[PDB]
Design a protein around this ligand. Structure first.
Ligand SMILES: CN(C)c1ccc(S(=O)(=O)N2CCN(S(=O)(=O)c3cc(O)c(O)cc3-c3cccnc3)CC2)c2nonc12
Ligand SMILES: CN(C)c1ccc(S(=O)(=O)N2CCN(S(=O)(=O)c3cc(O)c(O)cc3-c3cccnc3)CC2)c2nonc12
Ligand SMILES: O=P(O)(O)OC[C@H]1O[C@](O)(COP(=O)(O)O)[C@@H](O)[C@@H]1O
Ligand SMILES: O=P(O)(O)OC[C@H]1O[C@](O)(COP(=O)(O)O)[C@@H](O)[C@@H]1O
Ligand SMILES: O=P(O)(O)OC[C@H]1O[C@](O)(COP(=O)(O)O)[C@@H](O)[C@@H]1O
Ligand SMILES: O=P(O)(O)OC[C@H]1O[C@](O)(COP(=O)(O)O)[C@@H](O)[C@@H]1O
Lengths: 420, 420, 426, 430
């Protein structure tokens, strides 16, 4: 069979490793979202469109370099390239816009420049903030305050860049929306030979907590100048996916390199192969065993849907979401099935890329008179969207996750549907 | 906590054994159905009513002793005592009627008397047939043929009573509806020291097949004369439940003994305690791992519902059934939650006692004009009944299993309900 | 390779990856070949006082002889000890087939008051004077009760093993403190089934056996195991079930109280208990049992404990017929037993008391070495090795090629075990 | 007063992370402050070239932890490689003054390959005969595609080259497909990712690496991870975040050896790359989840009636039970040490042998620390055995392996000869 299914059927992880096949082509859609740093090499509207077609999910704006005028233009080009595909909603791919802060610099609270960068992001409608150099939970609260009452929906991903941040990780993760393993600065503050330990630990604690985790810095570094990466670069990218990272990131690879689209395509290729090599048998059992009991129907429905999808090898789990939460809760159980999130919120659709295996679609049509009808219309939108994108074929089984009443947090239904 | 919950939380079976508490009272309803052999000591309509209140689920008619007139009278008195409780529809407990055949005696095929006995059972509306001395799959086919065209809906439980029956078990189970470990005759054909091996093997193979299994003969033998059983008798009963038997049975204990109701009450008491001592953590994992993948939504919904019920420690899994199949498929995954089956079929309600943890409700209310309304009215019937019988309290969580259109084999929905 | 050995003593059922597949692979035609591990304790009464009949019970597999001091005078029980030791030493002519038997004293109990009853003090002093090996302390409810029994033994009764009978609710609740100070536990289901609901007795049994297995201390299942056999020649289906399940639960010993003491079939009950125990031992799922027992056992800096886990692991790897261990106090063999190997722990000791007492730990087969000590200890141990090997070649335990694990020490005495060595037979 | 000095232990070398019941819990328990204390297991293979040819710099590489010296026969004349052998052996035997701290180094020959078309290359025949004549210990057979290719290399060595270990470099798709037959006839495998990354898609190389390492771990045969491990260190003093990651992951995957090519052969930081590979490998070994690794390795290993194999599993089990500092094994061929290594113990497998070749070759097995016993054989073998055993104890005492009060597992045999191992004995230090 295909997509490492004989390797996934193995009773032991050693058996699984021995059953890995280079000829077993991956068929599932690429789960681990790609974050591309936008710079001179990736700012043109034609090239940005190419990167979207290549699989860029999030666009990073590094506020360490660049003026507010430069970054406002970065956003416009990004938006314009994304919106050119709006004419065909069944194929429109949303892209999130993230702001990577410059950092507290001198050491104390939040830098004055960062307050001005954060209020700019709020004004320009950014979805995610990569908080540079977070060392404690008070640093996160300061960033949340710097966004104000308008920046409430914006996701805060804390960049762990030093030893203090690693030690105080649990308090930072509790108050953050997710973590970024910013290996660049981290490789300097702590010994370079200990960085993998911090990466693997953070990814593990994030997987345990259900919160997104981003692997960052020098993933395909040689591709800035060369058309093909090193054997260690392909290895690192594949291992970040195998470790359980929700996102993979490109810095100078897409910002100032000669091969921006090629780095995106390469990251996509490796991530797709690594996802099929995931030992879901033990991964799901351990994730389920580790997850505490829940009396929230959204969480209870998530584990039931993931279990049901595993049983029939469901091609996708279509979930109707409003804030992204239902999709995030399905993602935490790491299913082999694609979590197709259908939401009317464009912000939630962009943000849900931080979760692994979540494929957002934006329902652009107005709500129907009968809620039951409007719900079924969105389920069909996700079936039609997944059919033209290759996710679904006729005769496939899908798990459909819905709620009992309109509004966020009412998810409670899982239903087994047969395609067409 | 109560119902061996600290013992169930343990990561290892040894830790589970060490965590068993005598003071941890069981709270869940008694799953393992009790089959009581009706004889002179239990013929009384007055006494039958007491045994129904004591927890008798199935009434066995041993055709080795007794005339057709004697047994048609026993059935008439059983049904009289059962329909006396039909005034309260939320608390009406259905009882199945089983016919235990005399056996092939000599051997050319099915005995001449058995053909008459089987024709009688069909005419008298029996639900289950205990086929005595089954040695091959041809023996089962002969019994099904004997049940003519009318009797095609009677469940056939094959009594494995000899060495040939044990050897040819897999072919017999494939054609049977379930197995009875008839240890009486079995303990004579094969060495008495090897009977436990055959019992444990058959129960294991039946659990793996999802088919019911009955433990029979000398379970509380001393209680025929004495008011209290031996330490080995309580042990055997508890161990049959721990082994994974769907049903426990009383022969002379209830048919000709001085303590018929007391034996039923005692079997109930032991079974309730043994069910709380079940290590569901490994049991469910092994049962799930062993069960093959399925493209049947009834099957897929069952594993999703059982997984969702474990996650929240759901009070009960309310399933709407017609043939009892949906409830049986939930039972095979051995949930801690009570599978409350809500059916309009009187026969299916009686027969569903063969599956462990299935609590049937006969829905006598008239069909509503709108099917979705009728489904919800039936779903609420299960909630009303369980809540009345102590199964449910307000604020509890239940897993509700339904289907997309009316008619059997369309089950595909699992929905997390919060009581009242 | 062993052709018939593939379908043998539930080996296909033991090879299974899951316990459910293990249950499905159990075969009635797979005859057990290994020696019977779970020791049998027979209560000696009027039906079993006869020296002639005692000899039959020894040949039938009785390992320990119980003296119930609830009935009988000191003269009545001293005669029993003489009858027993007489039958015991009748087989001493052939030391290679010499089966030692332990003598246990079951106390009457504290009656109805705080402290050890006055009769119990006399009974315990009697046992010390008569050289009993084990004491079944009736109605133990706390760790102070055990200390009182140990004090009543005095300076002479130091080697005597104290098995605490848990017979009531207080004893069940205070189990961990009682086990810490006891040498082992008896699940005295008779009295226990009265103090706590009869439907909760199996819970207490399974818990105690589990905690004893965890602690490495012996555990005895007692009362009404083959109760119907007091009057009838064959037991009930529930009785064979209970006996088999006690073995499957992990009990080191099975007992016959009243089934041998006053029943028409004393030898037949012993033979039946032996037959069931042998079948149940082959049905043990050693794959998960050993993994769980190893995982649960704490790490140790004691070479006797470290050697035990290494020897049990080595025996599983090659399907060693037996693990021959050279003990002095029965500790090295007890430490091997706690890891529950499929191989027979053949204990070779010069201590007659330790040889009798080592019956309390499951799978331990004691062989009293009567030959005199050689001038060189580095010669003595090597001859003590061959003594145990030839007892297996006589008793059927071993055949040519049947590899064995040999457990010895660096110097002679108590607790200097540190060597495990893989030996090939002939 | 605050007598918890065993709190410092159990908190070092990822011991809290190793004690976890689940692999997720293990990942969550990994600590950057938990310093590794055990000796570095995964052997380092350094490619010798212009940057690493001087005897002076070779001595620093040996002190930095180089275990095997690779001679790439794709570049270089027979005169150049023979001079490299003299410079290497000269630098190695400079430390022979203290046998209790002498570190042996193996010499490997990496062949040029069959070139353009089937059959063993004509240059390779000359190269292989040269290696035999010059006493090489290992041969990295370039571009092995089937079991016949291995047999051709074994034949090309001749009757003299019988002890030489043959590590087959899997460099193409055919080699990956026909892996099981190649491993059966090879002494070990090299995951030569350089050539491999060209023959098969670059995104599928990790799959081939992880599969090969897994099958090698299953078979008990050594496995080497090769090509671009610390590539940026050829020019820069510090590696990339992906390079440290890849090195650590090769160890975590279960590779017995890690390798440096241009990194030491033609780079500006040869010693620094060796020191860096050592640093990462040491940290990655403490992060190994031995709890499931040992259970899976034991479960997967077939039952054996060979006492050498039975003693190995018993010794590894006994070492985990007491957290033995080291497992001292007496070996002649290196087989007893290899069989202990396959079960992947946390204890250091200290191999004591009188064979200089076996001592060099035993570096291919992970966690095997060879010490060459130069003392003369005693008249009675019985005494001589417990003095070679004591040599290992005194060697560990000096080399920081053994502290007083520690426990060691000692693995010996019943008679002098290969494969006669059958004894495991628990010894307390000093
Ligand atoms: C304490 N001692 C002496 C022990 C005895 C037996 C075993 S065992 O045979 O390996 N063991 C049997 C019990 N199961 S299990 O409980 O998870 C269970 C798995 C099923 O698949 C299955 O159908 C039924 C059961 C089951 C359920 C409730 C009570 N009883 C059995 C786990 C596996 C031990 N494992 O570790 N310690 C063990
Ligand atoms: C949540 N995330 C981060 C996870 C990722 C992957 C897996 S997994 O693929 O099932 N997983 C891989 C790691 N092994 S293992 O560590 O026991 C190991 C078993 C071997 O047989 C073997 O050859 C090598 C190893 C091994 C690998 C890395 C470090 N030290 C040892 C266990 C099984 C997870 N299981 O639970 N959580 C998992
Ligand atoms: O995933 P979230 O953010 O909790 O919200 C998902 C919600 O979407 C629905 O499926 C559809 O309802 P809406 O009309 O608000 O879109 C709800 O029933 C469910 O609560
Ligand atoms: O258990 P069964 O035989 O599959 O029957 C359950 C059936 O009953 C329902 O739950 C309700 O419909 P009806 O009771 O009107 O047949 C169906 O949707 C489902 O297919
Ligand atoms: O059973 P124990 O108390 O652990 O002792 C076993 C003893 O066996 C021996 O191998 C032999 O002891 P002896 O020569 O004194 O009989 C000792 O080294 C060890 O102390
Ligand atoms: O590693 P190998 O080839 O199995 O050799 C191990 C051998 O070493 C010894 O300990 C000593 O052997 P030598 O005297 O031949 O060196 C043997 O008893 C054992 O058989």
């Amino acid at each position: 069979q295909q997509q490492q299914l004989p390797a996934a059927m193995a009773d032991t992880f050693l058996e699984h490793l021995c059953l890995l096949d280079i000829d077993s082509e991956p068929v599932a859609a690429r789960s681990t979202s790609i974050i591309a740093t936008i710079g001179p090499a990736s700012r043109s509207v034609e090239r940005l469109k190419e990167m979207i077609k290549a699989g860029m999910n999030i666009a990073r704006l590094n506020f360490s370099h660049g003026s507010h005028e430069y970054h406002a233009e970065s956003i416009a080009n990004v938006r314009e390239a994304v919106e050119s595909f709006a004419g065909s909603p069944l194929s429109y791919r949303p892209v999130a816009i993230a702001l990577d802060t410059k950092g507290p610099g001198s050491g104390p609270g939040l830098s004055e420049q960062d307050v001005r960068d954060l209020r700019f992001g709020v004004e320009h409608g950014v979805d995610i903030v990569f908080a540079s150099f977070v060392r404690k939970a008070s640093d996160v609260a300061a960033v949340r305050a710097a966004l104000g009452p308008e920046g409430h929906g914006i996701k805060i991903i804390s960049k762990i860049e030093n030893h203090e941040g690693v030690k105080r990780f649990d308090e930072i993760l509790e108050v953050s929306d997710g973590i970024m393993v910013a290996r660049g600065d981290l490789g300097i503050e702590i010994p370079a030979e200990k960085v993998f330990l911090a990466q693997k630990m953070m990814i593990g604690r994030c997987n345990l907590a259900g919160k997104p985790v981003v692997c960052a810095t020098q993933m395909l570094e040689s591709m800035i100048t060369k058309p093909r990466p090193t054997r260690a670069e392909t290895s690192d990218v594949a291992n970040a996916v195998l470790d359980g990272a929700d996102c993979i990131m490109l810095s100078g690879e897409t910002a100032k390199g000669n091969f921006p689209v090629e780095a995106v395509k390469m990251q996509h290729a490796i991530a797709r192969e690594a996802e099929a090599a995931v030992y879901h048998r033990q991964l799901f059992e351990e994730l389920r065993r580790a997850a505490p009991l829940s009396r929230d129907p959204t969480e209870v429905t998530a584990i039931g849907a993931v279990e049901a999808a595993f049983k029939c090898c469901a091609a996708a789990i279509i979930v109707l979401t409003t804030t992204g939460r239902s999709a995030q809760l399905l993602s935490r159980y790491r299913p082999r099935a694609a979590v197709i999130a259908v939401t009317r919120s464009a912000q939630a659709a962009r943000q849900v890329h931080l979760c692994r295996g979540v494929f957002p679609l934006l329902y652009r049509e107005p709500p129907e008179a009968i809620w039951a009808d409007d719900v079924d219309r969105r389920v069909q939108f996700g079936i039609e969207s997944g059919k033209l994108r290759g996710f679904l074929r006729v005769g496939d089984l899908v798990i459909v996750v819905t709620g009992w009443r309109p509004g966020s947090g009412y998810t409670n239904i899982m239903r087994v549907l047969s395609i067409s």
